[PDB]
C-alpha cells in the first residue's frame, strides 16, 4: 500500500522553487486519501476520474496555478505540469505551521527566468538576474536582481497571502 501518509504528514515542506520529489514504488492503491478529500482546500485530478509525489509551499492566490496549462510566476518559473498530466493536485492551508509573527522568510519563489521551465523541471540556481541591458557581474541594483523572493508569511495575512502546502501525485 502506497506510503502517502509520509508525504502528507511531513513536518517540513520544500520551497516551491526547490520543490521536493518523492518516488513511490509500484504499490497497492490506498483510496482513503480520496475519501478524506474534505480535509483539504482543493483536491482535483486530471486525466482520471510510475508514482511521484511532489510537494512544496505557495501562497493561497497561487493555488490555481498548480494545474495543466496554467500561466504565471509559479507555473512558468517554479513548478510546471504538462498538458497530458495524469494525477491529482491536493492543497491545504498551512498558516498554523508556516507563518510567523514578523514574517517567515524561509519559503522562497523564483521571480525571473530567461525562459519558462519545462514540465517537471526544477531550477535552484541563484545567479543575479539581468533585468536591463548591462551585465550584473554578481551585483544587485535597480536593473540586477537576486532571482528568488521570500513570501514573508505572517499569521495575520489575508487568506490569499497565507501559506498553502501542496502535494502533486503523478501516476
Amino acid at each position: 500500500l502506497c506510503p502517502f501518509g509520509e508525504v502528507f504528514n511531513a513536518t517540513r515542506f520544500a520551497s516551491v522553487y526547490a520543490w521536493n520529489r518523492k518516488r513511490i514504488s509500484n504499490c497497492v492503491a490506498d483510496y482513503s486519501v480520496l475519501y478524506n478529500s474534505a480535509s483539504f482546500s482543493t483536491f482535483k485530478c486530471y486525466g482520471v476520474s510510475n508514482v511521484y509525489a511532489d510537494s512544496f509551499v505557495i501562497r493561497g492566490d497561487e493555488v490555481r496555478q498548480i494545474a495543466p496549462g496554467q500561466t504565471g510566476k509559479i507555473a512558468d518559473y517554479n513548478y510546471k505540469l504538462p498538458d497530458d498530466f495524469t494525477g491529482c493536485v491536493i492543497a491545504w492551508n498551512s498558516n498554523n505551521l508556516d507563518s510567523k509573527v514578523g514574517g517567515n522568510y524561509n519559503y522562497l519563489y523564483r521571480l525571473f527566468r530567461k525562459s519558462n521551465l519545462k514540465p517537471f523541471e526544477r531550477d535552484i540556481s541563484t545567479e543575479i538576474y539581468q533585468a536591463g541591458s548591462t551585465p550584473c557581474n554578481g551585483v544587485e541594483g535597480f536593473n540586477c536582481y537576486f532571482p528568488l523572493q521570500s513570501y514573508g508569511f505572517q499569521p495575520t495575512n489575508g487568506v490569499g497571502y497565507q501559506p498553502y502546502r501542496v502535494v502533486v501525485l503523478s501516476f
Epitope: 480520496l34 478529500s37 493561497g60 492566490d61 493555488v63
Partner: nanobody
Framework: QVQLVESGGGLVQAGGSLRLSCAAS????????LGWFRQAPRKEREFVAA???????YYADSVKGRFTISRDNAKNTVYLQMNSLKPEDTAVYSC?????????????????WGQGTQVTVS
Amino acid sequence: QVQLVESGGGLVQAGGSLRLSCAASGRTFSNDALGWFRQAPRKEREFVAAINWNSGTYYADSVKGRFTISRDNAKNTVYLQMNSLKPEDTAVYSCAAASDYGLPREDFLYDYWGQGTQVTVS
C-alpha cells in the same frame, strides 16, 4: 455555465432560526463542493460553511454549533440551517460551487456564484 439561485432570506428576531436553500443547474452537482459565504456592510466577504462530494463539512468558527450545511443531490440543492441567530449574523448570504473534490473555504477557489439573499436579525 452552472446557475445558482438562493432562497429563504428575510427578517428574523434574535435567537430565531431560518433555512436558506440554493438550487443549482448542471449535471455535475453531485461531485461538486458547495459553499456559503456572507457579506455584511463595511465588512469583507467571509466564509460560512461548505460541503463536498462525500458530504464532509466544514464551518467557520463563528457559526459552528449554530448552522448546519446539507445537500440533496436528487434536487440539486444545498441548504444552510441557521439557528440561534445573533444580530451579528445579519448579512447577504451567497452560495458558490467548485468543480473540486476538496472542501474549499476560500472564495478564490470557487468557480460559480449565486446572487445572494438578505438575512437580517433584529
